[PDB]
Design a protein around this ligand. Structure first.
Ligand SMILES: *P(=O)(O)OC[C@H]1O[C@@H](n2cnc3c(N)ncnc32)[C@H](O)[C@@H]1O
Lengths: 294, 976, 76, 76
């Protein structure tokens, strides 16, 4: 079988699973055994829930158990608490031919008690301890930006809708609008500067920064210290494609070694290239240590 | 000025100008029955300059049905004189006096507004003529059993400064056409919301600068996103920018005198299903005086057929227009009685009208208002022998409902949630009704304490009752008002944590629940409890002059949770972070900065100081959480710890510099001010305002205020003594050196190192204390800091600043509230409670209420019936449920459902938990199958089962025999 | 036929509707003109609350009639 | 004649615009289907800009060509 076929067959079974995120504690309390961003909000919510929330979450789980996107280029994996459907973690792999390609990005999703009237809360965890801004819509503090996640006046088609909007819609919106091949033009106003040499140089600079950022955090840190919920899936994904990531990073290095027209962008590109070489040496060191999955 | 510490909630409804005008108005109130008492109470709580209570009748037993300030010992005394002493304590700023002399012409000249109740026809006509001839506002109010009548005559020329009370709406212009019919298009296809024929003004307009600060112009709404202002060819071409703001145009109207308005009345429709009722009620109320004159000043006897026929004949002789004879007979039958909720509602309406006359705000009634509550009576009526007086304080109530309904009321048990304004009014009405005076009881709960600002609208509390629990004080007050009332008070907050007291057995003996809460979570919880226990629930809610009542009847109507309300409006992340364009955004940003600086930055340090073994607990946390906590603790305890107030001032100056200079410079470096898109619109255009970094100036009051507030708060956080001297702060802040700023384009080892640093350098003798944001205190500098921060950020983006009033309204999430709306809504809710207690089940009798006293407006509608769904041909609603008894295993539960209901359970849940699912791990499924359901619930919920829990509620998603999903009712699992 | 819808806040709405149309269509028009989603609208006429699945003929809504768009409140 | 223009649902639909049609004309012919304002639309070809002043012929867009239409994508 082809390697893509093996990837698709192996990761199909593990798209939607449950994990023990909360365990019993003393004096009728509970504690989190995994690092969840919305733990404080979960504790504040307590046992409050809208009557329609249980039905909405059941329908959402039924949808996610079969309709999660899956491909050789990009895939989405969702893990939920074994006793609470309103606490979830999302892993999204970067689409091919993008600066995020073959990079594992982790999100924390918490459904408020007013769901589905209020949009769910999602926070990006793969930010390198708030030192990396992976996208204009992905602030380094972890906040994720989408028009679908806003109940603000906006437009009735673009707002969060109690009926038509869904968790799968939000995941697809992230996958299709945030991890774009050219993240620089995601910022409004900059979108119309494309096609100019200055815009191309700015996009190249941003892509060079994102390349090393993804190589360091989305790959090396995920391999070294994977999340407990996404350990085996990350291991399988990185073992099955290790030649592909090696080739893609080598191509990135060759692209970054090309001459630049402006010195201001050239210095940053060279610095990012050195940083990427330093990170790629470590990534090659770590990849060879991956024990092949059973 | 107006005492904001007392009228804080009422100011957001009325306004400074309106309150100033009411502070110079004298009120005369004639008649001190129940309706007069409610009018006087609401007016005094409003805060008029003075009120004079005039009455000629003496206190009697019948007056105790609605007058809560008279006792049996007051029988024989003048009502006004007896009630004046208790009425004065409501508000010390209002001078209250009692008058017993005749209403001479010279005496009437001293009052701006004159209110007439229980006055005869000739006196009413004379006083109305004198008031109209001398420019004195007159209001006539009457209550006869289950009927009401309100008349307003505010003079020949009355000016209204705010016709509806809604805040002006401002929109942003994208393009204006330059021709004879110039069309204004809003920004990025956003609805302006302007009404047809509105008046708007323009500002910040480039090119058409002549429109800046121009007089208001009549507009023509051409669509949801466009409108026309007329000919714009005389001005220059439009470049960009501009803000169009709605302007409230005053209106002048003329009020007909009573002697003229009687023949040609204009009716304000109270119920839209009874359009013909006011026409008949006008004639009935007019002919009541003739009947009294023809029967020695005696009203028709309660439920007497002969007297009803005589009154019908009098009505026929008095008027030639056709009238509803059945309505006339009913009115004559129940005209001699009196009830409390009706008096409260009409008193609230009349007090709002008095305030409108005094201040000139809101549109008054034009001109007659007639209301009835005939649905409260039994369908078969009341036997005459049952309505005879029995020498009791409820005689006026027995004259309406009879003795049997009084006995039913005495044995009724009702639960009131929340003891706020609505809760206090509901408690007063229930006590006056005689509810629970026999074998029944009245339960009231509230977790809050009395605050000074609460005294403005809560009349059950006194200035010396501050810091006392609300529920107990209200219970004691209504016990004083009526000694026969039995009340049990609790200091608990309703929820999952207080089910020990509010258990299933507590709700089992209840007959109904009245909601007086101020949040949605408590409302949903009370709805769930009422649905589970199958008891009626009455929901009340107010917002300024707006109000609503919803009645829920088991097996009859839908629940409060069946419908949805608009969600709370969130702010887009970038608008809060980098691109604010309104004062609300800056206020929210200031609140977030306050929280993050003074509360979140010190919680970990305080926990570490208080708990000696905090480090060992936080060393076991998963992920990078231990590092994120230790680094914050180190930063709060060593790096940023100030050793003196001068260090606090330096920190405040540096924080100001970073917040208003460095970040703005970085933002401008990222996006140049003159950045232009390819097609022509600038990047810093439309909703995007180009900022400019500020220059620090100690002479600027805003900068000094921010420095002072920030330094004082920082010193308070670290325990350093505050220095409340503005001159000292100004002197100290001038010596601070600001570093230059330029724009920019092993874990175990770390935790061990940081732990060593804390145990070596950090001192446990510090007094780290996070600050809790308090808004009603003017000495904690919280509001001053918030105002300074928001105004500085507004000046950063050229956003118009907001004063302390608007900042406190927005940042503090204040809900405006007034006493009149509370009284009206509580009266309506008590009417619905009476309807429920009677035994009505047809949805026609029940009426959901909606009111807006500003317009004024009030309408009613039948509650919607519960939605019907079918599974296997069996109809079910939200009130139906499955009944599973005994103790069964999870496998036994699934087998029971599969064998009996032919439903295959694919997802079983208990509240927020998930006991069973189709995608659960096989090991856990095998483990949970043989265990009892109680044990499974205990394991999944991670909490023990309390002894008071006698049953559990499960929600199931089931598949029929054919494999398609079907909606099924919830399951009530009875523990053995 | 032309009907008017009065919001609880006092703003007046003008609609162009022929009888026989389902409430859903009326709520859709009101949404287009103001912006409230259909499930957040409460229409009151002649003491009755308009429900989805019915037409104006059942409620006898004729020309120049007035409806009321009421809403619930969270204070107390 | 027939060319394809991208829509909301990811699918690309069949529309009757001309190379001689300006991008304003293309926007109008997209508008006549759903009422979407011309200024909301950004016509794009393989990630490259198209704007009102030009016609489709200047970008060699003709029969069987596809347009990646994105409705002036918004943000945070
Ligand atoms: P307004 O805010 O004047 O009156 C509301 C009162 O209700 C009390 N309250 C709110 N929420 C609850 C819960 N969950 N339980 C008990 N009492 C509640 C507030 O404290 C006000 O007194």
């Amino acid at each position: 079988k082809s390697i893509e076929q093996r990837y698709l067959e192996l990761m199909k079974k593990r798209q939607f699973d449950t994990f023990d995120m909360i365990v019993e504690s003393d004096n009728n309390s509970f504690r989190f055994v995994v690092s969840h961003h919305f733990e404080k909000m979960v504790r504040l919510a307590g046992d409050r829930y809208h009557p329609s929330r249980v039905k909405r979450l059941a329908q959402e789980a039924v949808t996610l158990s079969t309709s999660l996107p899956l491909s050789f280029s990009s895939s989405v994996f969702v893990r939920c608490d074994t006793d609470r459907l309103d606490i979830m973690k999302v892993l999204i792999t970067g689409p091919a031919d993008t600066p995020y390609a073959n990079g594992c990005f982790e999100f924390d999703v918490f459904f408020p008690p007013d769901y589905p009237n209020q949009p769910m809360l999602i926070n990006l965890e793969t930010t390198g301890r708030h030192s990396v801004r992976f996208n204009p819509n992905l602030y380094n503090d972890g906040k994720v930006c989408l028009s679908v996640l806003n109940t603000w006046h906006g437009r009735p088609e673009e707002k969060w809708n109690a009926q038509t909007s869904s968790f799968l819609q939000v995941l697809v919106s992230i996958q299709s609008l945030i991890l774009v091949p050219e993240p620089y033009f995601n910022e409004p106003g900059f979108e119309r500067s494309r096609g100019s040499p200055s815009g191309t140089n700015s996009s190249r600079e941003y892509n060079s920064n994102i390349y090393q950022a993804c190589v360091r955090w989305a790959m090396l840190e995920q391999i070294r210290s994977p999340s407990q919920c996404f350990k085996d899936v990350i291991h399988k994904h990185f073992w099955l494609k290790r030649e592909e990531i090696c080739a893609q990073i080598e191509g990135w290095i060759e692209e970054l070694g090309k001459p630049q027209y402006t010195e201001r962008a050239s210095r940053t590109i060279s610095f990012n290239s050195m940083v990427l070489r330093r990170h790629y040496r470590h990534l090659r060191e770590e990849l060879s240590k991956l024990k092949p999955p059973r | 000025d107006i005492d904001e510490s007392l009228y804080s909630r009422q100011l957001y409804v009325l306004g400074h100008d309106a309150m100033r005008r009411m502070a110079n108005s004298d009120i005369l109130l004639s008649g001190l029955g129940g309706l007069g008492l409610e009018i006087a109470k609401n007016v005094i709580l409003g805060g008029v300059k003075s009120i004079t209570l005039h009455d000629t009748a003496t206190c009697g037993l019948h007056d105790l049905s609605s007058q809560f300030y008279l006792t049996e010992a007051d029988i024989g005394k003048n009502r006004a004189e007896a009630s004046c002493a208790q009425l004065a304590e409501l508000n010390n700023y209002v001078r209250t006096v009692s008058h017993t002399g005749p209403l001479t012409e010279e005496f009437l000249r001293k009052f701006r507004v004159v209110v007439l109740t229980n006055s005869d026809g000739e006196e009413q006509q004379r006083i109305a003529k004198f008031a109209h001839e001398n420019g004195i506002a007159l209001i006539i109010a009457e209550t006869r059993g289950l009927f009401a009548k309100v008349f307003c005559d505010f003079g020949e020329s009355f000016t209204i400064y705010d016709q509806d009370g809604t805040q002006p709406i401002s929109t942003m212009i994208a393009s204006i056409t330059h021709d004879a019919q110039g069309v204004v298009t809003c920004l990025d296809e956003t609805r302006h919301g302007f009404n047809d024929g509105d008046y708007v003004t323009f500002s910040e307009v480039q090119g058409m600068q002549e429109l800046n600060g121009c007089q208001p112009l009549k507009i023509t709404v051409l669509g949801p996103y466009t409108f026309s202002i007329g000919d714009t060819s005389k001005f220059g071409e439009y470049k960009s920018g501009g803000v169009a703001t709605q302007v409230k145009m005053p209106k002048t109207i003329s009020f007909k005198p009573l002697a003229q308005a009687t023949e040609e009345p204009e009716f304000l429709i109270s119920d839209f299903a009874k359009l013909d009722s006011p026409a008949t009620l006008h004639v009935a109320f007019n002919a009541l005086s003739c009947y009294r004159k023809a029967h020695n000043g005696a009203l028709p006897r309660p439920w007497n057929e002969e007297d009803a026929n005589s009154f019908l004949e009098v009505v026929r002789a008095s008027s030639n227009a056709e009238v509803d004879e059945k309505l006339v007979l009913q009115f004559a039958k129940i005209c001699s009685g009196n009830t409390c909720p009706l008096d409260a509602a009409v008193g609230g309406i009349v007090a709002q009208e008095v305030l409108k006359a005094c201040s000139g705000k809101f549109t008054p009634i034009y001109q007659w208002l007639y209301f009835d509550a005939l649905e409260c009576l039994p369908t078969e009526g009341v036997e005459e022998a049952d309505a005879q007086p029995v020498g009791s304080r409820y005689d006026s109530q027995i004259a309406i409902f009879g003795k049997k309904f009084q006995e039913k009321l005495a044995d009724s048990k009702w639960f009131i949630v929340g003891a706020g304004a609505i809760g206090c009014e509901l408690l007063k009405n229930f006590g006056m009704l005689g509810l629970g005076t026999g074998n029944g009881q009245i339960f009231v709960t509230d977790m809050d304490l009395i605050e000074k600002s609460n005294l403005n609208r809560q009349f059950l509390f006194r200035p010396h009752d501050v810091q006392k629990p609300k529920s107990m004080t209200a219970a004691d007050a209504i016990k004083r008002m009526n000694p026969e009332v039995n009340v049990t008070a609790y200091e608990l907050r309703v929820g999952a944590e207080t089910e020990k007291v509010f258990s299933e057995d507590f709700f089992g003996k209840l007959d109904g629940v009245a909601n007086a809460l101020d949040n949605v979570d408590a409302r949903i919880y009370m709805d769930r409890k009422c649905i589970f226990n199958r008891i009626p629930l009455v929901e009340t809610g107010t917002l300024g002059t707006l109000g609503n009542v919803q009645v829920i009847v088991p097996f009859a109507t839908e629940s409060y949770s069946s419908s949805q309300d608009p969600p709370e409006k969130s702010i887009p992340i970038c608008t809060l972070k980098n691109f604010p364009n309104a004062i609300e955004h800056t206020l929210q940003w200031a609140r977030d900065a306050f929280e993050g600086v003074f509360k979140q930055s010190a919680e970990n340090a305080a926990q570490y100081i208080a708990d000696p073994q905090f480090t060992e607990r936080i060393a076991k946390l998963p992920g990078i959480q231990p590092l994120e906590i230790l680094d914050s603790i180190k930063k709060a305890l060593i790096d940023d710890k100030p050793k003196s107030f001068a260090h606090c001032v330096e920190w405040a100056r540096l924080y100001w510099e970073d917040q208003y200079v460095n970040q703005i410079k970085q933002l401008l470096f990222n996006f140049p001010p003159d950045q232009i898109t390819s097609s022509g619109q600038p990047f810093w255009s439309g909703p995007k305002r180009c900022p400019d970094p500020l220059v620090f100036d100690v002479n600027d009051p805003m900068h000094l205020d921010f420095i002072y507030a920030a330094a004082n708060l920082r010193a308070e956080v670290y325990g350093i003594e505050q220095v409340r001297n503005r001159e000292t702060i100004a002197e100290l802040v001038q010596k601070v050196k600001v570093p230059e700023f330029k724009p920019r384009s092993l874990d175990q080892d770390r935790v061990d190192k940081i732990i060593s640093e804390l145990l070596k350098n950090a001192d446990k003798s510090s007094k780290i204390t996070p600050l809790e944001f308090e808004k009603d205190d003017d000495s904690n500098l919280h509001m001053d800091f918030i105002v300074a921060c928001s105004n500085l950020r507004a000046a950063n983006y050229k956003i118009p600043p907001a004063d302390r009033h608007k900042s406190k309204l927005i940042a503090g999430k204040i809900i405006p509230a007034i006493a009149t709306t509370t009284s009206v809504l509580s009266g309506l809710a008590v009417l619905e409670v009476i309807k429920l207690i009677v035994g009505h089940r047809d949805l026609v009798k029940f009426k959901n209420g909606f009111a807006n006293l500003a317009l004024p407006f009030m309408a009613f509608s039948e509650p919607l019936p519960a939605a019907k769904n079918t599974y296997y041909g069996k109809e079910w609603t939200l009130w139906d449920r499955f009944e599973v008894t005994g103790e069964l295993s999870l496998q036994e539960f699934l087998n029971y459902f599969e064998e009996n209901e032919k439903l295959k359970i694919t997802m079983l849940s208990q509240g927020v938990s998930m006991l069973y699912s189709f995608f659960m791990p096989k090991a856990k499924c095998s483990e949970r199958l043989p265990l009892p359901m109680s044990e499974v619930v205990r394991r999944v919920s991670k909490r023990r089962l309390e002894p008071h829990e006698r049953s559990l509620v499960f929600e199931i998603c089931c598949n029929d025999v054919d494999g398609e999903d079907v909606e099924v009712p919830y399951v009530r699992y009875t523990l053995p | 036929m032309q009907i008017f819808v009065k919001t609880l806040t006092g703003k007046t709405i003008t609609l162009e509707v022929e009888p026989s149309d389902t409430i859903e269509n009326v709520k859709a028009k009101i949404q287009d003109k103001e912006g409230i989603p259909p499930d957040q609208q409460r229409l009151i006429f002649a003491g009755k609350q308009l429900e989805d699945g019915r037409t104006l003929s059942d409620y006898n809504i004729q020309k120049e009639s007035t409806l009321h768009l009421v809403l619930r409140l969270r204070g107390a």
